[PDB]
Amino acid sequence: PEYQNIFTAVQVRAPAYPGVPLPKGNLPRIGRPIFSYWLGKIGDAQIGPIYLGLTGTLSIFFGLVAISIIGFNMLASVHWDVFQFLKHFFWLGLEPPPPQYGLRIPPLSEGGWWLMAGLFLTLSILLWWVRTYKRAEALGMSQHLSWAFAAAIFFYLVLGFIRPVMMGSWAKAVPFGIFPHLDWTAAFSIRYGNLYYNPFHMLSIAFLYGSALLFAMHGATILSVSRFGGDREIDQITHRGTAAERAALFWRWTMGFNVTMESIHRWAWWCAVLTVITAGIGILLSGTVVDNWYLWAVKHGMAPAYPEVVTAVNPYET
């Protein structure tokens, strides 16, 4: 047997770190940090403090309004009956405006709340993007997080905003609800002739699977060399240690090639980012360019053919 470094067996405590000092113009952080013993079994025990300037304050306000408009309409849809709200929660949703209204602002009683929730969540997310940018700037760090976040925002924007406007109707955006947004996902594939045959859907899957592949590989690799301090990747990158050396040789010996302690995080960065880049393109092309992905795949010679063992007379021909 051996220690697997999954749980911290013996936690130590020190007075909470208030954070690296930020340049003038940043607001003071807020909150008195607390320690969670149980969070400390799997990771860092400190919770807080937090930074909250104008960007994040504006972001949270937009976001609370958006979330409440959704919940209010969910509760209204079971006539304020809290017990039925809990019964039906996973089924409830806030529905996009009917197609008859196009891209015009629809009535409060029939779609106006969705558009307001969509506007304010979108602004809330865009302000959160600025927050990720500013927090790196104040620490003197490069902008990799905000670049990756922008890729996720791109996909989010394509789903609910760019494509509906291109298609001339808010009715083609996504409803706010757990199971309702799953209906939207399945119905979208049905309507557009089977999303499996969308090549950017295929790529997005390759990269989503690859993210789990790469984090399983990297996550597992680092814990196996954490006995050599391999989790301390900053100093393994500047001052290659036997942690970084043994990690590369494990993979070199397994599959014939390897990366570095720094560059695995580039592979990881791009794999995750390409998941949502290709997803946005795939949705951006659906309805706007390709109306039936299967027939598009047939046209370019991709669709498999099978021996005919079932077949049906088309009653519309007869």
Partner 1 sequence: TMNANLYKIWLILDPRRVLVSIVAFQIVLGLLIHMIVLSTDLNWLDDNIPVSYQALGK
Partner 2 sequence: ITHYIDAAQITIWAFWLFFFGLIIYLRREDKREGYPLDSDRTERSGGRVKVVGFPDLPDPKTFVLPHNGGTVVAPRVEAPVAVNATPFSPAPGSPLVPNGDPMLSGFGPAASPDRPKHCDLTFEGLPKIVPMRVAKEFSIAEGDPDPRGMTVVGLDGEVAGTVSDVWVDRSEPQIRYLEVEVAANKKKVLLPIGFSRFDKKARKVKVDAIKAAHFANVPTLSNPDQVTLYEEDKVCAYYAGGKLYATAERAGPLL
Partner 3 sequence: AMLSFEKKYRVRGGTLIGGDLFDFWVGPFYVGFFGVVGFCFTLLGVLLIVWGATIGPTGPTSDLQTYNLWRISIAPPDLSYGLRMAPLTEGGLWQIITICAAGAFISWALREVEICRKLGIGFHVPFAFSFAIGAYLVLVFVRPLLMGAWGHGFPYGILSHLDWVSNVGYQFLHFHYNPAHMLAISFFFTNCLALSMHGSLILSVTNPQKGEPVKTSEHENTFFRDIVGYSIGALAIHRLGLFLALSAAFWSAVCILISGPFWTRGWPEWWNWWLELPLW
Ligand X SMILES: CCCCCCCCCCCCCCCCCC(=O)OC[C@H](COP(=O)([O-])OCC(O)COP(=O)([O-])OC[C@@H](COC(=O)CCCCCCCCCCCCCCCCC)OC(=O)CCCCCCCCCCCCCCCCC)OC(=O)CCCCCCCCCCCCCCCCC
Ligand Y SMILES: CC[C@H]1c2cc3[nH]c4c(c3C)C(=O)[C@H](C(=O)OC)c4c3nc(cc4[nH]c(cc(n2)[C@@H]1C)c(C(C)=O)c4C)[C@@H](C)[C@@H]3CCC(=O)OC/C=C(\C)CCC[C@H](C)CCC[C@H](C)CCCC(C)C
Ligand Z SMILES: COC(C)(C)C/C=C/C(C)=C/C=C/C(C)=C/C=C/C(C)=C/C=C\C=C(C)\C=C\C=C(C)\C=C\C=C(C)\C=C\CC(C)(C)OC
Annotation-wise, does 88 bind a ligand? no
CA distance 195 to 60: 35
Is 9 a residue that touches partner 3 (CB under 8 A)?
no
Question: Measured between alpha carbons, how far is 87 from 157 in angstroms, rounded to an integer?
Answer: 31
Cα separation, 223 vs 22, in Å, equals: 32
**Is 178 among the residues that bind ligand Z (CB under 6 A)?**
yes
Provide, rounded to whole angstroms, the least separation between the CB of residue 213 and ligand Y.
4
For residue 309, how many C-alpha atoms fall within 13 Å in the half-sphere facing its CB? Answer: 3
Partner in contact with 178, chosen from Ca ion, ligand Z, ligand Y, none, beta carbon below 5 to 8 Å by kind: ligand Z
- From candidates 119, 126, 150, 298, binder to ligand Z by CB under 6 A: 119
Three-state secondary structure call for residue 256: coil
Structure tokens belonging to residue 133: 């940018």
- Does 101 appear as a known binding residue? no
Return d(Cα 296, Cα 290) in angstroms, integer: 7
The answer to whether the annotation marks 265 as part of a ligand binding site is yes
User: What angle (nearest 5°) sits at the alpha carbon of residue 301, between those of residues 299 and 305?
Assistant: 110
If one asks whether residue 56 binds ligand Z (CB under 6 A), the answer comes out as no
Positions in 141-180 near partner 2 (CB under 8 A): none
Could you say which residues in the range 89-108 bind partner 1, by CB under 8 A? 103-108
- Which entry of Ca ion, Fe ion, partner 2, none binds 232, CB below 5 to 8 A by partner kind? partner 2
Inter-residue contact 41 to 11 (CB < 8 Å): yes
Answer for the pair 131, 56: CB distance below 8 angstroms, yes or no: yes
Q: Is 317 annotated as a binding residue?
A: no
Residue 20 DSSP one-character state: S
Comparing CB distances to partner 2, the nearer of 137 and 262 is: 262
Does residue 64 bind ligand PGV (CB under 6 A)?
Answer: no
Positions touching partner 2 (CB under 8 A) are 1-3, 5, 8-15, 20, 35, 37, 40, 44-45, 199-200, 203, 226-229, 232, 235, 237-246, 248, 257-263, 266-267, 270, 274, 278, 281, 285, 289-290, 296, 299-300
